[PDB]
Amino acid sequence: EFVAMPVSTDLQYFRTACNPRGRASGMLYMGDRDADIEAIMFDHTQSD
Amino acid sequence: TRHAGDFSTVSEQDPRQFPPQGIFFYNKDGILTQLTLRDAMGTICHSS
Numbered sequence: 001e002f003v004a005m006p007v008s009t010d011l012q013y014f015r016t017a018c019n020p021r022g023r024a025s026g027m028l029y030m031g032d033r034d035a036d037i038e039a040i041m042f043d044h045t046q047s048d
Numbered sequence: 049t050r051h052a053g054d055f056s057t058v059s060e061q062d063p064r065q066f067p068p069q070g071i072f073f074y075n076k077d078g079i080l081t082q083l084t085l086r087d088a089m090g091t092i093c094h095s096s
Contacts, residue, residue, distance in 0.1 A: 012080050 024048055 003020070019025060025041045039046070057064060069085045 012082070018056055
């Protein structure tokens with residue numbers, strides 16, 4: 001499978017195990033409320 | 049240097065000569081961190 005991407009992304013990130021979207025996702029990253037999960041993926045106003 | 053020909057780049061002036069504007073080090077897992085001088089714009093850029 002293939003996906004287009006920019007050319008000025010560094011090799012720092014691709015030497016260790018990581019996620020192909022570049023935006024680190026997950027479900028173990030919060031566990032008290034419910035309205036806070038969709039933004040762990042679909043919010044770039046915040047930080048990675 | 050130790051050996052004339054180390055980290056030599058194709059460009060006519062080895063950019064290592066120029067003033068360094070940052071520093072890198074290892075994180076909690078073993079990945080390179082990119083700490084840039086511009087991060088001082090939150091501490092030295094104060095009204096004080």
